[PDB]
Design an enzyme around this catalytic site. Sequence first.
Site, PDB file in Angstrom:
ATOM      1  N   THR A  88       7.000   4.043  12.261  1.00  0.00           N
ATOM      2  CA  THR A  88       5.589   3.634  12.169  1.00  0.00           C
ATOM      3  C   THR A  88       5.401   2.113  12.117  1.00  0.00           C
ATOM      4  OG1 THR A  88       5.439   3.933   9.742  1.00  0.00           O
ATOM      5  CG2 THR A  88       4.878   5.813  11.138  1.00  0.00           C
TER       6      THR A  88
ATOM      7  N   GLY B 149       4.657  -6.112   5.297  1.00  0.00           N
ATOM      8  CA  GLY B 149       4.573  -7.536   5.058  1.00  0.00           C
ATOM      9  C   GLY B 149       4.381  -7.893   3.601  1.00  0.00           C
ATOM     10  N   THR B 150       3.402  -7.269   2.942  1.00  0.00           N
ATOM     11  CA  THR B 150       3.110  -7.632   1.559  1.00  0.00           C
ATOM     12  C   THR B 150       4.018  -6.892   0.588  1.00  0.00           C
ATOM     13  OG1 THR B 150       1.339  -7.825  -0.084  1.00  0.00           O
ATOM     14  CG2 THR B 150       1.320  -5.895   1.342  1.00  0.00           C
TER      15      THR B 150
ATOM     16  N   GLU C 103      -4.162  -6.344   1.100  1.00  0.00           N
ATOM     17  CA  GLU C 103      -5.210  -5.646   1.830  1.00  0.00           C
ATOM     18  C   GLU C 103      -6.171  -5.016   0.837  1.00  0.00           C
ATOM     19  OE1 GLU C 103      -5.909  -4.854   5.176  1.00  0.00           O
ATOM     20  OE2 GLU C 103      -7.549  -3.537   4.550  1.00  0.00           O
TER      21      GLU C 103
ATOM     22  N   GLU D 238      20.683   1.862 -19.847  1.00  0.00           N
ATOM     23  CA  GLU D 238      22.044   2.370 -19.762  1.00  0.00           C
ATOM     24  C   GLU D 238      22.460   2.710 -18.334  1.00  0.00           C
ATOM     25  OE1 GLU D 238      23.560   2.241 -22.685  1.00  0.00           O
ATOM     26  OE2 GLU D 238      25.531   2.938 -22.014  1.00  0.00           O
TER      27      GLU D 238
ATOM     28  N   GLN E 127       0.804  -1.219   0.000  1.00  0.00           N
ATOM     29  CA  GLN E 127       0.000   0.000   0.000  1.00  0.00           C
ATOM     30  C   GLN E 127       0.835   1.266   0.000  1.00  0.00           C
ATOM     31  OE1 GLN E 127      -1.032  -2.332   2.574  1.00  0.00           O
ATOM     32  NE2 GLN E 127      -0.403  -1.440   4.534  1.00  0.00           N
TER      33      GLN E 127
HETATM   34  N1  LIG Z   1       6.631   7.375   0.935  1.00  0.00           N
HETATM   35  C1  LIG Z   1       5.580   6.698   1.384  1.00  0.00           C
HETATM   36  N2  LIG Z   1       5.753   5.691   2.307  1.00  0.00           N
HETATM   37  C2  LIG Z   1       4.686   4.999   2.764  1.00  0.00           C
HETATM   38  C3  LIG Z   1       3.412   5.290   2.312  1.00  0.00           C
HETATM   39  N3  LIG Z   1       2.550   4.455   2.927  1.00  0.00           N
HETATM   40  C4  LIG Z   1       3.247   3.643   3.750  1.00  0.00           C
HETATM   41  N4  LIG Z   1       4.569   3.977   3.665  1.00  0.00           N
HETATM   42  C5  LIG Z   1       5.676   3.334   4.384  1.00  0.00           C
HETATM   43  O1  LIG Z   1       5.431   1.946   4.446  1.00  0.00           O
HETATM   44  C6  LIG Z   1       5.885   1.435   5.674  1.00  0.00           C
HETATM   45  C7  LIG Z   1       5.061   0.222   6.078  1.00  0.00           C
HETATM   46  O2  LIG Z   1       4.599  -0.453   4.931  1.00  0.00           O
HETATM   47  P1  LIG Z   1       3.058  -0.305   4.508  1.00  0.00           P
HETATM   48  O3  LIG Z   1       2.924   0.376   3.172  1.00  0.00           O
HETATM   49  O4  LIG Z   1       2.320   0.455   5.578  1.00  0.00           O
HETATM   50  O5  LIG Z   1       2.476  -1.798   4.451  1.00  0.00           O
HETATM   51  P2  LIG Z   1       2.915  -2.835   3.316  1.00  0.00           P
HETATM   52  O6  LIG Z   1       4.310  -2.549   2.825  1.00  0.00           O
HETATM   53  O7  LIG Z   1       1.919  -2.791   2.191  1.00  0.00           O
HETATM   54  O8  LIG Z   1       2.836  -4.259   4.049  1.00  0.00           O
HETATM   55  P3  LIG Z   1       1.531  -4.663   4.893  1.00  0.00           P
HETATM   56  O9  LIG Z   1       1.504  -3.894   6.190  1.00  0.00           O
HETATM   57  O10 LIG Z   1       1.537  -6.143   5.185  1.00  0.00           O
HETATM   58  O11 LIG Z   1       0.326  -4.310   4.069  1.00  0.00           O
HETATM   59  C8  LIG Z   1       5.739   2.571   6.664  1.00  0.00           C
HETATM   60  O12 LIG Z   1       6.831   2.587   7.551  1.00  0.00           O
HETATM   61  C9  LIG Z   1       5.745   3.824   5.816  1.00  0.00           C
HETATM   62  O13 LIG Z   1       6.944   4.531   6.022  1.00  0.00           O
HETATM   63  C10 LIG Z   1       3.228   6.301   1.387  1.00  0.00           C
HETATM   64  O14 LIG Z   1       2.100   6.568   0.981  1.00  0.00           O
HETATM   65  N5  LIG Z   1       4.319   7.002   0.926  1.00  0.00           N
HETATM   66 MG   LIG Z   2       2.790  -5.403   6.819  1.00  0.00          MG
END
Ligand SMILES: Nc1nc2c(ncn2[C@@H]2O[C@H](COP(=O)(O)OP(=O)(O)OP(=O)(O)O)[C@@H](O)[C@H]2O)c(=O)[nH]1
Ligand SMILES: [Mg+2]
Lengths: 201, 201, 11, 428, 145, 426
Positions: free
Chosen positions: D170, D135-136, D62, D245, D11
């Site tokens: 976070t 996770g994902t 999700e 490149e 996400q």
């Molecule tokens: N730059 C940026 N970072 C994001 C954003 N959304 C989440 N993150 C980063 O993603 C990290 C956690 O991963 P998530 O995107 O929340 O979750 P995921 O990678 O999809 O894995 P799951 O929790 O299992 O769904 C957080 O520490 C955030 O720093 C975003 O919209 N922009």
């Molecule tokens: Mg996760």
Amino acid sequence: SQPVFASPLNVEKRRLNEERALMQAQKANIQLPPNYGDMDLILFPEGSLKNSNNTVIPQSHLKGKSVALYFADGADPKCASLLPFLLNYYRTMNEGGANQKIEIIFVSLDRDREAFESHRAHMPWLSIDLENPLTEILKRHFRVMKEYEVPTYGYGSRTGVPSVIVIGSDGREAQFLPICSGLEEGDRALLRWDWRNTKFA
Amino acid sequence: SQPVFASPLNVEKRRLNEERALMQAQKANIQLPPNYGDMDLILFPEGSLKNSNNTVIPQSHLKGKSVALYFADGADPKCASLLPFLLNYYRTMNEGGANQKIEIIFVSLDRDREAFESHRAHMPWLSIDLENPLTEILKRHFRVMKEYEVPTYGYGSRTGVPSVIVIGSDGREAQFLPICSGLEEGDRALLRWDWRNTKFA
Amino acid sequence: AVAQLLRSSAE
Amino acid sequence: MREVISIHVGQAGIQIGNACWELFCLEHGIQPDGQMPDAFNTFFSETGAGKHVPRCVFLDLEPTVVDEVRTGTYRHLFHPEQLISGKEDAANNFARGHYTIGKEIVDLSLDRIRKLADNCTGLQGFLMFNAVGGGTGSGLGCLLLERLSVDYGKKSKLNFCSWPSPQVSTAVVEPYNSVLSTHSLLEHTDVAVMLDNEAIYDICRRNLDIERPTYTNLNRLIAQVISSLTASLRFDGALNVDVTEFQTNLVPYPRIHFMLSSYAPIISAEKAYHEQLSVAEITNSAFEPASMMAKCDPRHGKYMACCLMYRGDVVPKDVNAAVATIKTKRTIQFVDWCPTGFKCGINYQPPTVVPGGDLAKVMRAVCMISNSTAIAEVFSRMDHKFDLMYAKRAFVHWYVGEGMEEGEFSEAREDLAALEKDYEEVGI
Amino acid sequence: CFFGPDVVKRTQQGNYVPVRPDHFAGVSVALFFAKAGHSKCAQIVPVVRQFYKTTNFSGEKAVIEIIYVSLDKDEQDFERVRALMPWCSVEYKSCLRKKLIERYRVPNTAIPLLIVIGPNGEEAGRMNFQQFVLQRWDYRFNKWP
Amino acid sequence: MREIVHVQGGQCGNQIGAKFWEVISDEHGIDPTGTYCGDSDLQLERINVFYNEATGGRFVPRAILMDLEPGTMDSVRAGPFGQLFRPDNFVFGQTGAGNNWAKGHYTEGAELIDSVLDVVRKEAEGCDCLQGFQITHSLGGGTGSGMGTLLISKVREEYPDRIMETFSVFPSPKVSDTVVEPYNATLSVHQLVENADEVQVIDNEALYDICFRTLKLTTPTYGDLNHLVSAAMSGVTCCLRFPGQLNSDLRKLAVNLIPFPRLHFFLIGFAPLTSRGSQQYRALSVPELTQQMFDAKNMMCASDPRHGRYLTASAMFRGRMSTKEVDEQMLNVQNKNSSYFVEWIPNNMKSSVCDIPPKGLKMSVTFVGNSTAIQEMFKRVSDQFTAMFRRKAFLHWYTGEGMDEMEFTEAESNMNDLVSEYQQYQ
Ligand SMILES: Nc1nc2c(ncn2[C@@H]2O[C@H](COP(=O)(O)OP(=O)(O)OP(=O)(O)O)[C@@H](O)[C@H]2O)c(=O)[nH]1
Ligand SMILES: [Mg+2]
Ligand SMILES: Nc1nc2c(ncn2[C@@H]2O[C@H](COP(=O)(O)OP(=O)(O)O)[C@@H](O)[C@H]2O)c(=O)[nH]1
């Protein structure tokens, strides 16, 4: 269809544009319903803008400037906080340059003429009078509302009082200055106003 | 003829077109009774259709747009669940584009006038007022009823409230979005709308 | 309820 | 006909790709309907009469972040099964996104990538936008990369991973997610680009003076980096470098590909009203250590290969003048075995600013992607953080009860420490 | 056109006249904010009056010109003090006076006051009188084209 | 999508979830008669998690109302939003466990538990796949802590891998009714420490303490206290029903709060909580909610958090806020009160930002903290229980209807090993 589709400006604009398009259709292969580009509307009528001295300022007077609607209330303390900052900014910007280039049009959130005039008595810029339909029509155009009473269609309220929004000739938000938004940079976001790309054509 | 032969709108259609055909035959090789491919209809009279600004909207304004009838009732929990999804589908459809694409004309199954106005304040597209007999002739034409209070003329029932009927020029059932039907796809059936080919002409 | 009037309050 | 395929897993990558695709729509002038009122071909296909679907797939376990796209404004931009959505999230678990719930949709993800990549020859590469702390993002990303290497063997693969920040997280479990991700994307990518959330936070705090930004303000900045990256594959330039490149002139050895990002100028509307955006200024700010998009100081790093992506009304004659200035500036170090390390690229199309956004309208911009020894400290904090947690078996029962064996933690730990050994021997 | 209509009044006995638009060429212009019934205005008016006559009608070309703007509360009072001031004035019912006051930040004890102005219409010299100081402003400063 | 099946055990848990479904219907725009009102997509795109279409268009909750006496059950139906529950979802009891663990669990809850597994499996299998069950029950009684815990066991041999969340109230520290409180408390703990995925602890003396010096309510009722619990109880499951910038489901909380499976007891707080004289006198932004959730004066359990140490914590924000001043201010509370957080886990605490606030409020937060400071609550039940047990007092009101002696020894030994697994991290 900008900004939203469920606004009386947009419904009125749609109706008049397809009336005139049908007039050229029976006069004449013309495309319909009309594109939002060829789609045109006069946004302010002749007797809609009044200054501090209640004199008519025409729609063509706003040529070559950056116009901004100030959706404002006389009783809101945050609006009473923002009004001196907006007044300072307007004075110093119109007074720094040779010509005057920015314009503020006040849109009322009051309830009666006494409070309306007591809020009018402090402002140098232009305004829209309260018992015009145009103030609530622009209200449902821009989704600015005290508390949810009218049913707005899908979208919630864009912003609360106070708000300043710079305006195109089509009614589109050229820029939303963040007073009460996801940025929440109140009583300073007048500095983010850009006027070189916002022009009332 | 299409969709069902014994509908009030179709029988008034056939009566009017045999009037004009016999009139021009007596005035004059003609064929009688006139063909279904030649038969003609005006679907909404002058003061029938009505927008959100309470201004009358003509029928000829709607050609070039995929327009559909929404048979709905305010006290129906189906319609309660369907209304926000329909609002969002209309709103995305008419924001993401270069011109207006789809249109909805509302037909009511409400109890009375106050309920009609309270439900009409929750939808921004066109509507047909309850005391206008166009609502009931459209209900009998498109086999939409809550409960059996009009005799169905050896019919069954096509659909119950709520319904969306994509319409053509002559009252043609173009396609039925299967919300409450044999397919039972509630609120996912809006995505099946084929606005490219179902065009009001 | 007073909890209703406190938690979901806006005015 | 050049074409790039975008992959957005997690996400974080879905919301990054939302800002990434509205920028691509505005610069090629397509409405959210999908048709204008052949230089666009690398990002959009031809669909009958005038329409254009993006060459992207959206993967997330999700359902909420993808169903938001299906119900939002761009609901008829995307082809309906480019948006692939699971049922349960991976829930911040590398193991669960790798071994049980990731495999019932990765078959559909490969089936859709098969469906869109065989439409033309001249595929240029794959971009992937994922989060290593989730996770994902790190789990489903790893299966997708290993299956991409098996089928599409020689294809270029670029990565844009949101590395967790040194100070802000976070999450609590993400040190475990990061060490298993960076182990397996070492052998399954070609060029890896470090994006750090806290680094972009300091960028928009100082340069635009946005004191309170959201994720949708950070994703516009990443989107502008991708746009100025693949600008050469969309617009005619004075001298252009394809994205194939980069893996020739920016990586000297296969194991060393993790490398930074920078963008200059990134200025507000009233910032441009008092500043001239000279090329020497916008390449000096791109070299400024606080303008990095990774939050790592390169003053104690050692540069190896820097690529500069100029974009706008930039003549090549002051390109060479400006890059000669940063040669003679002693604060910027360069490694001894790379005397020349600059492969410039100039494009004619000025950057496109989104309406109602926060960036100004600029006539020229710089997208700097540079490989430095400063990647040693971005993994040295994961060295400490994974050591503290794994010292007495923290959060391990979630991973091992999922189905993976006890020991992938140790071998991912040893591959990261070996990676730190590989970086320090380069810099001597 | 700045001022615009007749609102710039030239004094005349028997009938009332507006001063012509381009009268102000080659002259230096000062706005005189005053209000009748004020104790301070009662001495500021005769001093600037004697200065007006002495400076302006020694040289054959008119060198200064004074535009009278008032904070009066009564139109008859305004008339009987306009009949006392020998320089150019502005109409009471005209809103140009309100525009000038609201632009130039004249409060409703800073009264009375002088603002000598430039050809485009902006502030060129500010002079209060709250307490020999009147000689400070020079007529050869605002030579207008 | 994900679905959370609700369980209403005990008469305290019946009234807690009675106000919970009042809250969820209020934010989802659900009429007590089942119709929808509120005409917005965001209230309805995720409504299958807690409600079911019922070929009338009405939304029945996926909740099982379960008790051993029908007096409190008819109070739910006669009250507001009691028209909403399905009649077959009530499971009537006739005799009633008299604040007695053995009657609830062994001898009198046995002939009713087969009737309630019929309706739990009926609702669970009706969807393709659910996320977990949330269990609301009381530990000071017999129907809740005796019969509800056997329901916690049975749905765990049959559904092993689903999230077992429970909102449970515990005996209050200072003064209490139901004199066999430590008996039903310890016997419910040693069953629930291996059968519950996450436990959210609530104390009534803590809920009372909230209403006094942060709400200034001179007369708080039980409807007042139930809305306190329900405000944070939907405050955990925000992201299932609503989108957000950083989503988090119940198992996101489960995997990212417990480092070890046997310790899963969570202190719960809610914010912002302002009185009538002070609502319009307080700013409503990120930096003052984060001080509020880190207080001993807001927490809904009577365990002083600064006595212990925060192992791992979490915050679920709701509403319109900027994610940056959220982001570094979880840091900013971590590094000023560094002695209150554990060192061998870096960055002890998670955020998750949701885009939809509760109605009236523009932004809120719910805090879930796995603190070692709950050891004082366990040891208070410990020395109360061993004071009664050593004199064999009230023991014939358990050992005489189906149970024996040595499971009391196993109850205090499991509870003491639960104690000892906490100060080794403190
Ligand atoms: N730059 C940026 N970072 C994001 C954003 N959304 C989440 N993150 C980063 O993603 C990290 C956690 O991963 P998530 O995107 O929340 O979750 P995921 O990678 O999809 O894995 P799951 O929790 O299992 O769904 C957080 O520490 C955030 O720093 C975003 O919209 N922009
Ligand atoms: Mg996760
Ligand atoms: N917070 C809260 N606590 C309650 C409520 N009703 C009862 N209790 C508590 O429950 C305890 C008694 O347990 P009880 O529910 O009667 O046992 P049960 O009949 O077996 O479920 C008392 O200490 C009460 O304080 C309620 O509505 N809210």
